[PDB]
Design a protein around this ligand. Structure first.
Ligand SMILES: Nc1ncnc2c1ncn2[C@@H]1O[C@H](COP(=O)(O)OP(=O)(O)O)[C@@H](O)[C@H]1O
Ligand SMILES: [Mg+2]
Lengths: 168, 372, 317, 187
């Protein structure tokens, strides 16, 4: 969790809080319309350069910013394939309820497992000095959950094995 | 690698930290407790299970179960929960980035060792791990190389004589009387004065009573005769309920169970006779040195005046021509940890790990043929 | 449910309904079971006559093992010549059933329990051989090892009921050891089955359940006695769980339950892997809810006026 | 055996446990012809795990412990005792004996005592003794089935012998020299 992820976590925090200087901006190709500019990528003069934060080859933090919208996709550790399946299913459930989260994408960008997307409106109404707090909190708690759920798998396997075998 | 993990997963208490440090970063009771009521409240963050210090603090509405019984883990689910707690909630370091050192009592079933190694390698994916005996750790901590070690803890008491750099596995004596049995006997003999302790919370309270009041006398008959004129021996304790209880001859009676195991109805030698037999089982040429080096270790050996009485009994048993000396450092409560850290911070120890690449190519039986 | 059922529930319910009924009706339904076994129910000749058929890929090996006689003395005179496309057939007419209700119920249960009833022939044969060797060894203790070896050689029996499964069973003077050649395709199934099998081994070890038969599992290598047996690949991806059934585990009062249990083992393991998947689903959603709780910060307090129920404030003030 | 039963998980401490373990050694333990080969066989312990029904009704199962404890006789280093096995002990005893009767003693190897009742001890010890000794003479082992009470049988034969009555120790004959009268003529 922490006491363990200081430099990576603080680098992500600083980069995210620096990249969240959004602004209301309409569409330069369609009139009377405004769209998240990071997702469309049609006007390159307002798209800041993509930025990547990493701690190890299996952990990355792609930070793509724009004038109004910021997309922030991360990779979390999957040491063994058990954690691979657990991470995939858990993060699918996480993104399946993006309606009540307001900063999630229903489908992550390829080569990743989750992609946040903070449009202007979220910074407009929701005070954003704890969106990053939620970000880092999730980035550590997710590994916590994966470990706990694999423990629960082992426990249930033990219980069912005992229940089956005792009734000879 | 900068530092290596090390965890003393003892039966009653668990000690964890980094190799080379001189202070336990994390010590919490090895307790996993589940609620036993309804919770008509709303919210409150209903947590399914509380482990460690949280369970010790909220024992009012919880039932506590020790995963390790008599040094053998019996609830692997609770053991995994405790290891997860140590890794994430208190030390909060990723297991996959730190080799770990574990401790297991001698003469335990091989199933315990194999299962522990497999769990650490697969469920936690540690880089490397090692399993060591308590007596070797005690010798490492004390700075000695020769001397029989008495390791009395919460779960089991064992003796492992070790000459200069060599251990005699055939002279290892293991006794299943320990702090938990002493606490149970104290609970049983506190009933004769009226006070009754039943639930696990009462068991922890009695453990605190034994912590703060129990001590070992010098001569049992003389101490009982003195207690007959019960004038200047009784003490008082304050329960959390606020009621004050008085303690008497049972203040020192229950520590004597170590020296007279017949008190709890078990036919075995005391912690002095077992040491004498363990020394006599060794070669004759090394007894003259093992007598001079008696090592006290573990939490149970923290009773006041236990060392003096044990020295008296061993001197009585042994011939008078050769002197008997017993040693007990004031920090012997964490002697096992100190030895473990000293061993883990040794350059010559770097090639004695068990790496994952070594483990997966030989199965979980590799621990038997490498660790010990 | 924790334990899988031991017979086909549909057959049991259908038989009970048609026996307790007064006006029978023509039926033609083919029903599949676990492990590829298929059952067919039809009434071709008379409305009161019901024919039930059994399908199994390994049935000729059962015939080789001597299952026709066991089926005969199990099902009495009910035996009928097999139908096309099926292995074992039975024809029942409602006009000859015993009047007593308990006889009808036990007949329905026995017919519905046809799967293990036909699959238990090797187990019965192994038990008889075990009794023979037990009495022969009791005749002279000094004559044990050579007869034990010759029984391990000659009486070594095997069967292939799935293309990734195998039972290898052989008797002795005191025990009837059985080997399962488990293997799971559908990668995630094998992924969870690794943990399931590892935990299943440990179980026996625990002193809590020492009364159970001894288990022995070691992947990437088969036991000594079955490397030369045909059909056993040289540890490609197949595990090998071995149960050692001692004399106490098949006492004359516990043979049938042990047979059914050891038969249903693999299906229980599969179903419980699926149940573990569901357990993940529910826990994972249950506390991604907690993550949503953690997120629900960063929302300044707002007030909704009424939003009473199934409507919009139901009033102008 | 008590020491090595612990690693399986079982615990035996009291003297009642001592008698129970003695009965277990009575019924189950046997001697392995080749230690390494039998350990390799027990690695795949398909047919080397008997079950003993304890008096409490809870069964225990032992694998290589069946034959690991009887090998202490052949390998005394197992228990830390520094000595040769019984086979090499007998070989040394015969070698130190005078040469003219070594061949006779090779052909007469009597087995006696309760401990020598392990199944197959005679075959293993015969093999090892022949390996130790030169191959030019034949060696055989005598293991009567009655060897449990062979000492009594010999005592009875000696007592019933016709000329033994002069070898007794009469009370009067004991009176003169006190307790030490036995040493001068008993053996
Ligand atoms: N000062 C003390 N006086 C009396 N008993 C103590 C004292 N300190 C610890 N104990 C007992 O010793 C036990 C500590 O066990 P511990 O030595 O941590 O076990 P392990 O060596 O297996 O980790 C506690 O349960 C407690 O009852
Ligand atoms: Mg300890």
């Amino acid at each position: 969790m922490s006491n363990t992820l200081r430099p990576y976590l603080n680098a992500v925090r600083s980069t995210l809080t620096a990249s969240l200087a959004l602004e209301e901006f309409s569409s330069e190709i369609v009139e009377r319309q405004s769209q998240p500019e990071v997702e469309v990528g049609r006007s390159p003069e307002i798209l800041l350069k993509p930025l990547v934060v990493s701690r190890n080859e299996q952990e990355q933090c792609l930070i793509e910013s724009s004038v109004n919208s910021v997309r922030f996709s991360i990779r979390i550790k999957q040491v063994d394939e058990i954690e691979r399946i657990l991470v995939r299913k858990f993060m699918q459930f996480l993104m399946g309820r993006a309606e009540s989260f307001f900063i999630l994408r229903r489908k992550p960008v390829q080569g990743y497992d989750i992609s946040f997307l903070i449009t202007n409106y979220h910074t407009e109404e929701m005070l954003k000095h704890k969106l990053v707090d939620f970000i880092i909190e999730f980035m550590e708690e997710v590994d916590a959950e994966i470990s706990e759920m694999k423990l629960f798998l082992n426990g249930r396997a033990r219980l069912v094995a005992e229940t089956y075998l005792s009734c000879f | 690698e900068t530092t290596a993990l090390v965890c003393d997963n003892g039966s009653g208490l668990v000690k964890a930290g980094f190799a080379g440090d001189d202070a336990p970063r994390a010590v919490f009771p090895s307790i996993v407790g589940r609620p036993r009521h309804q919770g008509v409240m709303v919210g409150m963050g209903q947590k399914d299970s509380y482990v460690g210090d949280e369970a010790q603090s909220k024992r009012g509405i919880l039932t506590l179960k020790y995963p390790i019984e008599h040094g053998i883990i019996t609830n692997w689910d609770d053991m995994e929960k405790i290891w997860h707690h140590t890794f994430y909630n208190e030390l909060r370091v990723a297991p996959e980035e730190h080799p770990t050192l574990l401790t297991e009592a001698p003469l335990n079933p091989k199933a315990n060792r194999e299962k522990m190694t497999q769990i650490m390698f697969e469920t936690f994916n540690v880089p490397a791990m090692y399993v060591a005996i308590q007596a070797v750790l005690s010798l490492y901590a004390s700075g000695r190389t020769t001397g029989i070690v008495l390791d009395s803890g919460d779960g089991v008491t064992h003796n492992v004589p070790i000459y200069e750099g060599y251990a005699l596995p055939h002279a290892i004596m293991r006794l299943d009387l320990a702090g938990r049995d002493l606490t149970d006997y104290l609970m049983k003999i506190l009933t004769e004065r009226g006070y009754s302790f039943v639930t696990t919370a009462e068991r922890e309270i009695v453990r605190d009573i034994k912590e703060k009041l129990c001590y070992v006398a010098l001569d049992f008959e003389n101490e009982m005769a003195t207690a007959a004129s019960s004038s200047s021996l009784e003490k008082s304790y304050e329960l959390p309920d606020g009621q004050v209880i008085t303690i008497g001859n049972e203040r020192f009676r229950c520590p004597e169970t170590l020296f007279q195991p017949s008190f709890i109805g078990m036919e075995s030698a005391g912690i002095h006779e077992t040491t004498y037999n363990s020394i006599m089982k060794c070669d004759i040429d090394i007894r003259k040195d093992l007598y001079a080096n008696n090592v006290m270790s573990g939490g149970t050996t923290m009773y006041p005046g236990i060392a003096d009485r044990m020295q008296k009994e061993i001197t009585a048993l042994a011939p008078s021509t050769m002197k008997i000396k017993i040693i007990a450092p004031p920090e012997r409560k964490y002697s096992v940890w100190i030895g473990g850290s000293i061993l883990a911070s040794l350059s010559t120890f770097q090639q004695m790990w068990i790496t994952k690449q070594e483990y997966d190519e030989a199965g979980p039986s590799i621990v038997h043929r490498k660790c010990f | 449910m924790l334990s899988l059922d031991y017979n086909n529930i549909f057959i049991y319910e259908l038989l009970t309904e048609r026996f307790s009924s007064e006006n029978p009706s023509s039926i033609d339904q083919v029903v599949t079971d676990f492990d590829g076994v298929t059952f067919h129910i039809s009434t071709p000749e008379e409305k009161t006559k019901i024919l039930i058929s059994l399908s199994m890929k390994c049935y000729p090996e059962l015939v080789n093992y001597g299952t026709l006689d066991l089926l005969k003395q199990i099902y009495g005179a009910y035996v009928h010549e097999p139908e096309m496309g099926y292995n074992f057939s039975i024809l029942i007419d409602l006009q000859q059933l015993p009047a007593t209700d308990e006889e009808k119920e036990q007949l329905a249960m026995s017919i519905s329990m046809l799967k293990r009833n036909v699959l238990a022939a090797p187990f019965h044969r192994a038990f008889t051989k075990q009794a023979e060797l037990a009495d022969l060894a009791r005749k002279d203790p000094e004559n044990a090892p050579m007869l034990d070896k010759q029984a391990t050689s000659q009486e070594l029996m095997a069967i292939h009921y799935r293309d990734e499964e195998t039972i290898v069973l052989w008797p002795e003077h005191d025990r009837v050891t059985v080997v399962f050649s488990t293997k799971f395709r559908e990668e995630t199934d094998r992924i969870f089955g690794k943990v399931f099998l590892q935990e299943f081994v440990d179980a026996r070890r625990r002193p809590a359940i020492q009364t159970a038969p001894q288990v022995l599992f070691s992947y990437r290598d088969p036991p000594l006695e079955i490397r030369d047996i045909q059909g056993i690949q040289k540890g490609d991806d197949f595990g090998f769980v071995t149960f050692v059934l001692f004399e106490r585990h098949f006492t004359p009062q516990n043979r049938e339950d042990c047979i059914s249990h050891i038969q249903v083992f693999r299906n229980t393991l599969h179903f419980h892997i699926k149940a573990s998947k569901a357990y993940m689903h529910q826990r994972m959603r249950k506390r991604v809810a907690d993550f949503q709780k953690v997120l629900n910060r960063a929302k300044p307090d707002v007030e909704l006026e009424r939003k009473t129920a199934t409507g919009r404030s139901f009033v102008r003030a």
